[PDB]
RNA sequence: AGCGCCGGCCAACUCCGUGCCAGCAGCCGCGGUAAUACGGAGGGCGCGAGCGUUACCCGGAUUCACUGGGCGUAAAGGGCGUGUAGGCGGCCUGGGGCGUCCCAUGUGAAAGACCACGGCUCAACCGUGGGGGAGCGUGGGAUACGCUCAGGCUAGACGG
RNA sequence: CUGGUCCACCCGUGACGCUGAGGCGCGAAAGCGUGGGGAGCAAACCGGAUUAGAUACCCGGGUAGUCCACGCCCUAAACGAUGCGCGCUAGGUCUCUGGGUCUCCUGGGGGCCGAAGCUAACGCGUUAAGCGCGCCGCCUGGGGAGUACGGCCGCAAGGC
């Protein structure tokens, strides 16, 4: 499946801060701010130049392991979005947005995404009252992103929903704190939202 | 100020030694020469003077350029009469192209304008006042009229194009326009303003050089009448 | 001579290349329509109909730019670029959704049409397609 | 100031007595993303030297491309001796598609979606002056019927 | 949780062992006592219930070039004429309308493909609806170009 | 005895044209067959030198052959290493050979230098390797190999 290991080299190899986890991403115990240099014995010799390959390649592994998502499904998403009508980029980080584990990680249900998935996965999660265990679900507009009624009582999602109560959630979404309950409103723009990722560069790793 | 018995002084020359470019500035051949439609040398003296003036009243160098025996001092006359840069003597390749490093070399010469206006140390070695001496002898053999260009000119005129072609192409590479006396054996299409004549006869060089200072003098203040010449 | 409308573009191609004022083509009814076309278009001044020597020409009197600054002051064309497509070795033919856009737009396709001689923006205004003759720009 | 990009710095020998002696060439493309690039190609003993030099090459050599939302006015196809540069009008969710060199050129040169294909030989310098040539060659519906 | 890889192409570097041996290798190439190229290790890169390898097809290959190549010296002009078939053919006018162009029309099954919606928790998969096309049959139309039949011409060619 | 070709006149014919797979003819030298001829030269061959050696280079000899007729062979650095035809795109200069009105002009050849343009460069450039059209031939990495096999041709050699 996913990922599934060692989150902060990820952030150190990508050179960027990566939100990964959550809490922790904004305390001082932050690998970025410790030691803001590639894992491994290597981090602190000097970069030498790299190839535009190797830069393109960095640009899409950052967009990819922001989602925790696999290099197959991040593809076809990719696939789905050229032949797609309109502007490819956009499109693409769309349709990456729209997957439920993300909207779930978006409403504030989860801390992470990586949280939001097992939240989803065990079925804590509701689509227009609909139960939908699977992270790959395509979240459309119109759509109720709920809390399990029968999972409402978790401390989790409570603690993370307590900290929702006035929090601004992104234009293209709402949420109903209290009620537990959030909706997607549209497909957001490449400037409604600000990844620290150049999608053209992304473009052109496939196109190779 | 142009006149119209230029004709008692050149109307062109040269047997078949031309450039067909030249074609539409000729008359007929008639002594087995190229002679020179003088009305279309009316004409373009019209369009030529007209530019000549212009940059005069504005206040702009126009350096002129001749190196054949004949036009030698001809032009150091009626240039010095503008108060105009010249280059008379050896055509150095990048005066214009490279002109900062060649101005470098008035420097030189202006350091030993200075230097020999004495003393500042005779007191050098015996061998050596030969030497710099011989040095700005040499300068002023070539930097002479050059020196006066502090900067790139604004246009130049050139006697001989075919035979200047390096100062046309130099002023051409770096935009700066070119005004020429050019007979049938010069390239029209490199030449801004032409005055299409005979650039040999000394006397035509006169006519036509002369004639032009009187426009550059008369445009930017006062006038005057005859200019030094052989006959 | 086995293509006079090749020779014609030819004629014109090597005239413009050395920047004469006009060029004699010997003449002919389906000449004079392409030409008909190059001038309506402005990519030529115009032609008449001359006589060489006691034979029907076409006179094509040529356009270029304006005279250019730099080391190379020799004018832009106004016909950069003139062939033909359709040949006594291959005949082509378009129908009116074929017809090509020539240089997006910037350049014209000439046709001959059972409605006669037409620009690409002709022959698809008046729906038909036809020979491709040439193309110009 | 504009943005500069070295496209190739390479070494080369010449032979001598007791051995070969180098010195080093730099392709470098200049640009600002509005309209304007330029290309110069330096020499010289070092790396940045040459690297330097051909900065000022680069921007004595300019050439003004005439750019519309991001794509070029029309289909151009240049020679430089054996080296062919196809160019081609692309919409906006394109993207610049073509090799690295010309993908320098074009880019700086604000160029933003565009179709592209090298043909012939594929030398990096002969191709980076094909396709410098290529936007020299560049014209406007203003343009040409100003012309005619 | 595994598999490949970390000399360049090509993303990922160090220690030891070895010492033109053992071995690696897709191409270029690595190995002769300080090997980022062999073998292990640490570390790293890339994918992940897969990862790699072999085989084969298209691509990159405008490297059979219709789109879209060439032949002085790189591979490439027949040793040279003569001429059969074939390919190709000057200026003007008319008939026909063969090629060619246009319109109408029939045919182009279903599946698949593309756009939309919808059903299996999503997807794969599947259902529902939509838009075509060349090609050929038929009917009507156009005549510039090519063809054909007819009549003129002299600029090609031939003859005096 | 006989072919090609150029010019001037602009008299006749009225597109009768271009190319050209096959076919046919011609095709340097060497070579072959039958017969002549044979001075000089000269493969093979013999000898002398040279040289470390010298089946060579040099020297002294020397037979085919070199020559003629007829019949074969059909190759080549058979080269401009550049197919033929037509139209178009600066000129300068030397030359051969026609016609002018004889300065010079204009045809047709043969060179050189060069406009634009071409070219990887060298170079080409109105005798194109420029810009175009037509038709033919040909190339598709080096060796294996112009080999093998088949076929066709040849007296053979050997050719395609
Ligand atoms: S902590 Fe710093 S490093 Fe570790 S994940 Fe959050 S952001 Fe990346
Ligand atoms: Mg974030
Ligand atoms: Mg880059
Ligand atoms: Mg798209
Ligand atoms: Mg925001
Ligand atoms: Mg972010
Ligand atoms: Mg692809
Ligand atoms: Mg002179
Ligand atoms: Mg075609
Ligand atoms: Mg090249
Ligand atoms: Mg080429
Ligand atoms: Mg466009
Ligand atoms: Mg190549
Ligand atoms: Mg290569
Ligand atoms: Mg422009
Ligand atoms: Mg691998
Ligand atoms: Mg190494
Ligand atoms: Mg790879
Ligand atoms: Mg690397
Ligand atoms: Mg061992
Ligand atoms: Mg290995
Ligand atoms: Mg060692
Ligand atoms: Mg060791
Ligand atoms: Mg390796
Ligand atoms: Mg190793
Ligand atoms: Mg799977
Ligand atoms: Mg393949
Ligand atoms: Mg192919
Ligand atoms: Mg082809
Ligand atoms: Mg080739
Ligand atoms: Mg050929
Ligand atoms: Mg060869
Ligand atoms: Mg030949
Ligand atoms: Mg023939
Ligand atoms: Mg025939
Ligand atoms: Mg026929
Ligand atoms: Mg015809
Ligand atoms: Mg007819
Ligand atoms: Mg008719
Ligand atoms: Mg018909
Ligand atoms: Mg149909
Ligand atoms: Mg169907
Ligand atoms: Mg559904
Ligand atoms: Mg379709
Ligand atoms: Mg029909
Ligand atoms: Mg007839
Ligand atoms: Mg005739
Ligand atoms: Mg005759
Ligand atoms: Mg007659
Ligand atoms: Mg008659
Ligand atoms: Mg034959
Ligand atoms: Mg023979
Ligand atoms: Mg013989
Ligand atoms: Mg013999
Ligand atoms: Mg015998
Ligand atoms: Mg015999
Ligand atoms: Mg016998
Ligand atoms: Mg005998
Ligand atoms: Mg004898
Ligand atoms: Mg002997
Ligand atoms: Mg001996
Ligand atoms: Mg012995
Ligand atoms: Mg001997
Ligand atoms: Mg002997
Ligand atoms: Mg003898
Ligand atoms: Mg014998
Ligand atoms: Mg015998
Ligand atoms: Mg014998
Ligand atoms: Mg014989
Ligand atoms: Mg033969
Ligand atoms: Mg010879
Ligand atoms: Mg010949
Ligand atoms: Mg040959
Ligand atoms: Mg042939
Ligand atoms: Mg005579
Ligand atoms: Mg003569
Ligand atoms: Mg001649
Ligand atoms: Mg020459
Ligand atoms: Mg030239
Ligand atoms: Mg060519
Ligand atoms: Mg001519
Ligand atoms: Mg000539
Ligand atoms: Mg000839
Ligand atoms: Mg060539
Ligand atoms: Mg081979
Ligand atoms: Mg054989
Ligand atoms: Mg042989
Ligand atoms: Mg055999
Ligand atoms: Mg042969």
Redesign the interface.
């Known amino acids: 499946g996913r990922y599934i290991g060692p989150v902060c080299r990820l952030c150190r190899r990508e050179g960027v801060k990566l939100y990964l986890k959550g809490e922790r991403c904004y305390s001082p115990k932050c690998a970025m701010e410790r030691r803001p240099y590639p894992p491994g014995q290597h981090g602190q010799k000097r970069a030498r130049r790299p190839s535009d390959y190797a830069v393109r390649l960095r640009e899409k592994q950052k967009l990819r392991r922001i989602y925790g998502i696999s290099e197959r499904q991040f593809r076809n998403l990719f696939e789905e979005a050229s032949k797609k009508k309109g502007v490819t980029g956009s499109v693409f980080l769309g349709l990456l947005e729209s997957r439920l584990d993300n909207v779930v990680y978006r409403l504030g249900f989860a801390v992470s995404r990586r949280q939001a998935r097992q939240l989803v996965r065990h079925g804590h999660i509701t689509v227009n009252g609909r139960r939908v265990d699977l992270p790959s679900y395509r979240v459309r507009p119109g759509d109720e992103i709920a809390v399990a009624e029968k999972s409402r009582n978790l401390e989790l999602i409570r603690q993370n929903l307590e900290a929702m109560k006035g929090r601004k959630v992104g234009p293209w979404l709402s949420l109903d704190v209290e009620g537990m309950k959030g909706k997607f409103l549209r497909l957001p723009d490449r400037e409604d939202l600000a990844l620290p990722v150049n999608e053209q560069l992304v473009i052109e790793f496939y196109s190779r | 100020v142009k006149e119209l018995l230029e004709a008692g002084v050149h109307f062109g020359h040269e047997r078949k030694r031309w450039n067909p470019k030249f074609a539409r500035y000729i008359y007929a051949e008639r002594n087995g020469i190229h002679i020179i439609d003088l009305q279309k040398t009316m004409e373009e003296l019209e369009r030529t003077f007209r530019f000549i003036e212009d940059l005069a009243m504005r206040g702009g160098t126009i350096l002129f350029v001749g190196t054949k025996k004949q036009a030698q001092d001809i032009v150091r006359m009626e240039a010095e009469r503008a108060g105009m840069p010249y280059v008379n003597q050896r055509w150095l390749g990048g005066m214009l192209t490279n002109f900062k490093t060649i101005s470098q070399r008035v420097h030189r010469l202006e350091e030993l304008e200075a230097l020999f206006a004495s003393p500042e140390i005779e007191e050098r070695p015996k061998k050596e006042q030969v030497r710099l001496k011989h040095e700005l002898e040499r300068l002023q053999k070539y930097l002479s009229g050059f020196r006066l260009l502090k900067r790139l000119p604004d246009a130049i005129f050139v006697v001989d194009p075919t035979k200047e072609a390096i100062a046309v192409?130099e002023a051409?590479?770096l935009?700066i326009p070119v005004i020429a006396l050019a007979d049938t054996d010069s390239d029209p299409?490199?030449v801004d303003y032409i005055i299409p004549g005979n650039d040999d006869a000394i006397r035509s060089i006169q006519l036509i050089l002369s004639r032009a200072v009187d426009l550059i003098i008369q445009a930017r203040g006062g006038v005057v009448e005859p200019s030094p010449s052989y006959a | 001579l086995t293509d006079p409308i090749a020779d014609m573009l030819t004629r014109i191609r090597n005239a413009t290349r050395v920047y004469k004022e006009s060029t004699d083509v010997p003449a002919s009814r389906f000449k004079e329509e392409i030409l008909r076309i190059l001038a309506r278009?402005?990519?030529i001044k115009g032609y008449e109909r001359v006589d060489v020597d006691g034979k029907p020409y076409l006179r094509v009197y040529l356009?270029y730019?304006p005279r250019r600054?730099?080391?190379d002051?020799?004018p832009?064309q106004?016909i950069h670029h003139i062939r033909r497509i359709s040949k006594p070795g291959r005949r082509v033919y378009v129908g009116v959704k074929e017809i090509p856009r020539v240089?997006?737009?910037?350049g014209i396709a000439i046709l001959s049409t059972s409605k006669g001689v037409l620009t690409d923006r002709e022959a698809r205004k008046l729906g038909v397609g036809g020979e491709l003759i040439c193309e110009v720009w | 100031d504009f943005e500069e990009k070295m496209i190739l710095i390479r070494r080369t020998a010449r032979m001598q007595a007791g051995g070969r002696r180098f010195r080093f060439g730099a392709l470098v493309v200049v640009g600002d993303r509005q309209g304007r690039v330029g290309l110069g190609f330096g020499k010289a003993p070092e790396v940045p030297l040459a690297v330097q030099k051909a900065g000022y090459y680069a921007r004595r050599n300019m050439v003004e491309v005439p750019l519309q939302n991001g794509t070029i006015?029309?289909?151009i196809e240049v020679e430089f001796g054996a080296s062919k540069i196809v160019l081609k009008?692309a919409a906006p969710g394109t993207g610049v598609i073509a090799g690295a060199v010309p993908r320098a050129i074009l880019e700086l040169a604000g160029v933003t979606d565009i179709l592209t294909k090298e043909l012939g030989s594929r030398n990096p310098i002969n191709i980076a002056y094909a396709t410098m040539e290529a936007l020299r060659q560049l014209?406007t519906?203003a343009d040409?019927?100003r012309?005619?």
Do not use: A, S, T
Request: proline fraction near 12%; glycine fraction near 12%.
């Open positions: 192409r051409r590479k935009f299409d490199l | 278009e402005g990519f356009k730019g600054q730099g080391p002051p020799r832009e106004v240089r997006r737009g910037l | 006015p029309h289909e009008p014209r519906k040409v019927e012309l005619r």
